[PDB]
Paper text:
The [name] OBD (residues 132–261) crystallized in three different forms that were termed form 1, form 2 and form 3. Form 1 has two molecules in the asymmetric unit cell, and together the three crystals provide four independent structures of the [name] OBD. [name] OBD region B3 (residues 216–220) is poorly ordered in crystal forms 1 and 2, but well ordered in form 3. Crystal form I crystallized with two OBDs in the asymmetric unit. The molecules are orientated in a head-to-tail manner and situated at approximately right angles to each other (94.5°). This dimer contains a small interface (∼550 Å2) that is buried between the adjacent [name] OBDs. Therefore, we examined the higher order structure that the [name] T-ag OBD adopts in crystal form 1. Interestingly, the [name] OBD forms a right-handed tetrameric spiral. The angle between the monomers is ∼900 and the rise per monomer is ∼9 Å.
The subject of this study, the JC virus ([name]), is a member of this family and the causative agent of a brain disease termed Progressive Multifocal Leukoencephalopathy (PML), a disease that is often fatal and for which there is no cure. Herein we present the high-resolution crystal structure of the origin binding domain (OBD) from the [name] initiator protein large T-antigen. The T-antigens encoded by polyomaviruses are multi-domain, multifunctional proteins that form hexamers and double hexamers at origins of replication. The topology of the [name] OBD is a five-stranded antiparallel β-sheet sandwiched between two helices on either side.
Numbering used by the authors: 134 to 261
The structure:
């Protein structure tokens, strides 16, 4: 059985309003390692990301990315789903950027690749 949602330990950081027509600038994707490998570079280029990271979790991968322009979650999901038939893929907006990335850099998650050397810094966002 493929996952039907992100792991529960990330729920608090994610927006559940997948049909929201508000535009946002931070997204997450949960899919296979094969599809995430491909999407890491495709999304980097498509959305001119300011940051993207790919993380492993129990054989699958999670992508996290930030964009210089805002987008609807539905648009990003549509683009990602184009790659899959087939493979599962969950796409949600991220409400708590630094907390989400931080969780993805601690067990049980691991960073596999990221687009800025040294990753995101706490000081790159305002405090909570």
């Amino acid at each position: 059985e493929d996952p039907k949602d992100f792991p529960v330990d990330l729920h608090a950081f994610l927006s559940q309003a997948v049909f929201s027509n508000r535009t946002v600038a931070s997204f997450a994707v949960y899919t296979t390692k094969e599809k995430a490998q491909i999407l890491y570079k495709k999304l980097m280029e498509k959305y001119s990301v300011t940051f993207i990271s790919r993380h492993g979790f129990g054989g699958h991968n999670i992508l996290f990315f930030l964009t210089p322009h805002r987008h609807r979650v539905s648009a990003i999901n549509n683009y990602c789903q184009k790659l899959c038939t087939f493979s599962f893929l969950i796409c949600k907006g991220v409400n708590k950027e630094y907390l989400f990335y931080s969780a993805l850099c601690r067990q049980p998650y691991a960073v596999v690749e990221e687009s800025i050397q040294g990753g995101l810094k706490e000081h790159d966002f305002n405090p909570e």
